[PDB]
Amino acid sequence: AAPTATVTPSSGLSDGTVVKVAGAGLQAGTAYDVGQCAWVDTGVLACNPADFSSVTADANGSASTSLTVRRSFEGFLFDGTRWGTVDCTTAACQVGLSDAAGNGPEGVAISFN
Numbered sequence: 001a002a003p004t005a006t007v008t009p010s011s012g013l014s015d016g017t018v019v020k021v022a023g024a025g026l027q028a029g030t031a032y033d034v035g036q037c038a039w040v041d042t043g044v045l046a047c048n049p050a051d052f053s054s055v056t057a058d059a060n061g062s063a064s065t066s067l068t069v070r071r072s073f074e075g076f077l078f079d080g081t082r083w084g085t086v087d088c089t090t091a092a093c094q095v096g097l098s099d100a101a102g103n104g105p106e107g108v109a110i111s112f113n
């Protein structure tokens, strides 16, 4: 019941744009791994190398974590293989945290409003 973890701005397509990501109704007192994950390869769900940033939302599911949106970088497929891309300007990169359950409910496709 909220926008969850989302970057302040919208045009995430900014040379490693540093902003704050507020997570409303997110990990209600829980914690996860914040990062921009998305299909990097041919529909292959690959996370960025900077998508590794522990996160924790207050009991009020308030995960106000700040990080940089490094659209450019070496992506890695979730399957097990690594891609790279270098520039995640093609596939919308979703900035969010991952659950320890094996799901990707959180993640805002940042890049362009």
Ligand SMILES: COc1cc(C)c2ccc(O)c(C(=O)O[C@H]3[C@H](O)C=C[C@@H]3O)c2c1
Binding pocket: 033, 034, 035, 036, 037, 038, 045, 047, 051, 078, 094, 095, 096, 097, 098, 099, 102, 103, 104, 106, 107
């Ligand atoms: C699908 O979208 C995202 C979004 C964010 C923020 C993500 C943040 C970190 C990630 O490592 C992933 C990811 O690996 O997605 C997999 C994972 O095993 C759980 C469900 C998916 O199958 C991810 C996927």
